[PDB]
Amino acid sequence: KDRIEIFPSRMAQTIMKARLKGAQTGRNLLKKKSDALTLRFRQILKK
Amino acid sequence: VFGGFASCSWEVKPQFQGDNRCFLFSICPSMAVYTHTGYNDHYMYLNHGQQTIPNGLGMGGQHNYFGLWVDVDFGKGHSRAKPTCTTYNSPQLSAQENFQFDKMEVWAVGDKSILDADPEAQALLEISGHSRHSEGLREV
Amino acid sequence: PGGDFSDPVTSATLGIVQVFWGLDKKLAQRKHFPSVNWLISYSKYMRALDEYYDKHFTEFVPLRTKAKEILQEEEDLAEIVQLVGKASLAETDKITLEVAKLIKDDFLQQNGYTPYDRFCPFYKTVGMLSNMIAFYDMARRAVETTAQSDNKITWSIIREHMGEILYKLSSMKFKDPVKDGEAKIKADYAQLLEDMQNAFRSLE
Amino acid sequence: PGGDFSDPVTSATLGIVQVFWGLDKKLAQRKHFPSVNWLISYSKYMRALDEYYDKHFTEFVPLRTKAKEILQEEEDLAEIVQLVGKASLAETDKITLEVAKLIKDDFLQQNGYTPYDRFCPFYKTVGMLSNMIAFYDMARRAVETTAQSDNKITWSIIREHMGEILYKLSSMKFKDPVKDGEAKIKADYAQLLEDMQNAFRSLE
Amino acid sequence: YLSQPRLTYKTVSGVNGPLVILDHVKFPRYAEIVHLTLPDGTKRSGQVLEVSGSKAVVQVFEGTSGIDAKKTSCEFTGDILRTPVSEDMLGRVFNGSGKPIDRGPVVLAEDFLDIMGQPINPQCRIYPEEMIQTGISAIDGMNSIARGQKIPIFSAAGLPHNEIAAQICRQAGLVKKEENFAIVFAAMGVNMETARFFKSDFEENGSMDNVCLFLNLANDPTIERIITPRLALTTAEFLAYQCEKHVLVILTDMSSYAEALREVSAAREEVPGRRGFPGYMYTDLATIYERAGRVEGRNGSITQIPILTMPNDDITHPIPDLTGYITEGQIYVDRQLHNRQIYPPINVLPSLSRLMKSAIGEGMTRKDHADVSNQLYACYAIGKDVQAMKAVVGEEALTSDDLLYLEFLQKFERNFIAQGPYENRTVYETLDIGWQLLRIFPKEMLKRIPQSTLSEFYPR
Amino acid sequence: VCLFLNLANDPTIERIITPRLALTTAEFLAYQCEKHVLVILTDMSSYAEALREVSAAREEVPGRRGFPGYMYTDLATIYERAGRVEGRNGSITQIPILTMPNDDITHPIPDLTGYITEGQIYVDRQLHNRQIYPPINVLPSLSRLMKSAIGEGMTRKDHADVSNQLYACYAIGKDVQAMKAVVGEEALTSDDLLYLEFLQKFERNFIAQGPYENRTVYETLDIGWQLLRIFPKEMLKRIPQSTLSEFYPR
Amino acid sequence: SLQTSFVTLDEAIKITNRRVNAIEHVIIPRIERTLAYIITELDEREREE
């Protein structure tokens, strides 16, 4: 639960830097997709 | 050749469903029809992947003692109405106690997938490290 | 050293020994003892003890395959409850989350420096394992028989009416195998079965 | 060791060579064959070849500038096309996902044992892109001048109406460059252009 | 011949771990076997690791306890390590050094071959163009082995990769549609429970008359494990390239070979490369593996199945990363299939054999082999996606076509992958098991299978 | 009190002999003077950085994180000079003090100390920022001599059962708190708004003390049962029936 | 029609959030802590070499 099983090497450093970076791009969608849905959600309460 | 008729729709539920118009018949050994006797209302049955009650299609009798049963391991079943049946007064339909079949027909009388359902879960599955196992193997 | 299981004394031992059980990854610094670690734990004498098991205990090996099936299915589901959160769980799987919580806290976890658990005889282990796998079969019928129509017995309804019985399943480890008898412990395990069987006849 | 630019052999080759025909393993199970990536693959012989293309072929550099761009605007759409899914989208983007799809199955698609795709002559190679870029710019000029006036259209009124145009634009890769004549292939791509200039004048 | 008598030096000038150096040695060879005599009367054996002028160091195999600088005589044979090789050693059991441990005689040699061998001419090597059937459905149905291939079985510590190997040793054979087929089983660094199992399995089933067994235990010295896979291949390179048989070599626990090659090289104070293993390990694994394949002119072939253990299930370890650089596939014994009690627990999704196209088809097995295999691989790939997605999204999102890829997935893991360790299926009854599993789907849904073979084999 | 002070500008290789000069006084005052001794060895991290220093320029084979090979038996030279002996009425109780660098319990100084000493007391940074004194994380803390030093006839009947239950409620409600960060405050059952109730009352009424409270061993337990009345009787699954029938209802 | 588009956007927001928080507090910290162990254990393999 505390580490993803891989062993320390130079290649396995770039893959867990890409998977972290490939997760921060997913959260950046979902951080603003929720607020874009919250942008319509206030207007229904403003209706 | 044997089988049965269902009076209402089939619906996947543990309870015994159906009413008194459901009957069993026979064709190729002999031609006879067995209507209901009303001793019990254990008419139809349909269960789809549980572990404490049987999984398959069944008509007549009770649990594990059906008068006609088709199992989930397809191409198998039984008609264990050894003296006769209880709901239908119907005999052992097959030649053996537990038959095996290759042809089945279901005829009505009168009148996307889970892989493409959630686009956020396929986004969360790829983020959590779990792969896809199949690109270029399925259609769209 | 350091709670990491890729140290060169473990992976050198894995290629030598025949039985091996190791503590968990999460439960190494915090004491939850014993744990299992299914990624390296094994015993290659599981096939070499089946002539003994059917002779003297004769119903333990059907219990062990289900007791390994509840635990190997909760490790699948614990990653998804940490990600979804009990929402994509039909009620037949919310039981397997909870008998595996009941086995890893009461059956597997053994306080070896108490006088009532420093030695657990093998009838008491099977007696403790019989009463939980009987409970898992009586719970998972109480959900699956009332499922699609109303009176949907969930796992939630099972906890409110049988709150005193799941403590008594957690009370099966407090039996002392010397102060109590051998057929006194077995005379108090079957009464838990006859109250477990009478606790689902009130539900159906 | 599994497709990276972290090892000292792959990263110290790309500091020396000029062409990188960059291939990946993810883009291989599409049965695409080659496994071309066209995002990390480059060629730095575009400035040296600005004299061969402008003298002998005199048309190709602006089509090559556009065709690398249409396959790039598809990428920054395709993450939202997966997550959101084509629901509230502009109609100039639906061109650069359907014309862009026409490139990725009829221009960058190969199969090496076939009697049409073991040799691709270059005059037929620029002959296929001479029609595909013209269909892109005429779909763009249609959707931008008919965006405000009267009877505004989308893409889904064209591809149903011009389904027989999208068959001739998809049967360019299946014309055999080996049996057919040298000038038997350019006239077919010059007769098709008047089935692409007249066809848009059947909708407006 | 060798007529000159051998010098028995007593000039031991230093002991350092397993190494003994000498002095006043007259013209010492490289890798020349010496025969030490201890003071208490016992004998050992060694090998010369470095000469320098009149001084040679000696790597003693069996240990170094008792070797003093006064009374131990080293007798220099003047010859490299050559092993006695015969055709009637099919049916014997030798240890890691060539000594027989089946209570039998020492082998009467036909010709003393050298255990380093010779490199095979690439101008005299032929592509593997038939099949070794192995009895296991997941290795013959979907990952078919060509005669002359090198396909490692990757595994982990605790998985049944010994019972798999012993099942392959009993059920290997041609794809008959047998006097020139033989197994050479080498076990390096096994514990005592495994090498009694390998000995009590090949007499209990009568499959001994074609198997040579080179056992090498963990309590045995670490240098015998180095020279064990060069005895098993020199026996194999004799049986196929001189006696014209089809040999299958099984090298159980090749990860313990790389644990000994690290132990020998650390004794010589040499430089370590990636993760402690020597620099020369890529050319030392390929010294073993590349003694395989069919040749031109002879009518024999050598197939190799090495067997590894990935430490902590990390495929990126240098023993699997470098054996996937020289060989031609994987098998991937999986843990998640073992924990649900399936035998053999073979993960067909990461397993591959790069030479499957030249082992199947008309004349080899049957003309439907290449299309059943990659269709079962597609309905097992989709089935592993459905159950991965139905746990995260919920149970009520499954349509009726979607449950069908789970009826396959359960019946694939019970009728195709589940075998039982004494059930020997030929290839004609792996595909007839595989064809009644493809009839779970209707005809319109099998899109990986062509129509010209769907209209011959599918309807029953 | 007998103070051996090696300050920060005092020379480094005196720190090799400073815990040896202090413990030899202790083993004199306990085994020859029959006194009870409490030995306080603060910043044992500054022992090993002055031992790594002397082995660097000596150029031995370095071990884990550059610390020398013989670091286990060297801290075992120091920590093992403790305990009682037969026929002498004195004792040495040892409390060294460490600093884990970057709060890593898997550094070679707390991981090799935890293999020699009998339990450890963990001081964590997260409870320090939340103004808790003392900030003691009981989840990785341990006393390997607690099991035979408590019980009936030493402290009280229910000591060993309360601490095993106060462990399991803090260890569970720290997992529900990490489940509250995913599914939010709303999707929590009513027997899991009890485990978050415990953590607000465990680390303020039991852990958080104030530097001048002399809380007895009975006053600690009587705090520990009013935290175990947070739950109903049928969830204290680590406490048997013989002790729950007497100590729970008050 | 306005109170029936409320309870569709009231359920779709309360799932996305449990999925932004399931990355912020579960997935991304686990990928960061294995990064802080690769830069540590490879400092060790440079030091022994």
Swiss-Prot record, chains C, D:
It is found in: Cytoplasm; Cytoplasm, Cytosol; Cytoplasmic vesicle, Secretory vesicle; Cytoplasmic vesicle, Clathrin-coated vesicle membrane. Expressed in brain (at protein level). It comes from the Eukaryota. Catalytic subunit of the V1 complex of vacuolar(H+)-ATPase (V-ATPase), a multisubunit enzyme composed of a peripheral complex (V1) that hydrolyzes ATP and a membrane integral complex (V0) that translocates protons. V-ATPase is responsible for acidifying and maintaining the pH of intracellular compartments and in some cell types, is targeted to the plasma membrane, where it is responsible for acidifying the extracellular environment. V-ATPase is a heteromultimeric enzyme made up of two complexes: the ATP-hydrolytic V1 complex and the proton translocation V0 complex. The V1 complex consists of three catalytic AB heterodimers that form a heterohexamer, three peripheral stalks each consisting of EG heterodimers, one central rotor including subunits D and F, and the regulatory subunits C and H. The proton translocation complex V0 consists of the proton transport subunit a, a ring of proteolipid subunits c9c'', rotary subunit d, subunits e and f, and the accessory subunits ATP6AP1/Ac45 and ATP6AP2/PRR. Belongs to the ATPase alpha/beta chains family. This is V-type proton ATPase catalytic subunit A. It comes from Bos taurus. The gene is ATP6V1A. The chain holds residues 413 to 616 of 617 of the full protein.
UniProtKB/Swiss-Prot annotation, chain F:
It comes from the Eukaryota. ATP binds at residue 144. The gene is ATP6V1B2. Expressed in brain (at protein level). Expressed in all tissues tested, but highest in brain and in adrenal medulla. Belongs to the ATPase alpha/beta chains family. It is found in: Apical cell membrane; Melanosome; Cytoplasm; Cytoplasmic vesicle, Clathrin-coated vesicle membrane. It comes from Bos taurus (Bovine). V-ATPase is a heteromultimeric enzyme made up of two complexes: the ATP-hydrolytic V1 complex and the proton translocation V0 complex. The V1 complex consists of three catalytic AB heterodimers that form a heterohexamer, three peripheral stalks each consisting of EG heterodimers, one central rotor including subunits D and F, and the regulatory subunits C and H. The proton translocation complex V0 consists of the proton transport subunit a, a ring of proteolipid subunits c9c'', rotary subunit d, subunits e and f, and the accessory subunits ATP6AP1/Ac45 and ATP6AP2/PRR. Non-catalytic subunit of the V1 complex of vacuolar(H+)-ATPase (V-ATPase), a multisubunit enzyme composed of a peripheral complex (V1) that hydrolyzes ATP and a membrane integral complex (V0) that translocates protons. V-ATPase is responsible for acidifying and maintaining the pH of intracellular compartments and in some cell types, is targeted to the plasma membrane, where it is responsible for acidifying the extracellular environment. This is V-type proton ATPase subunit B, brain isoform. The chain holds residues 257 to 506 of 511 of the full protein.
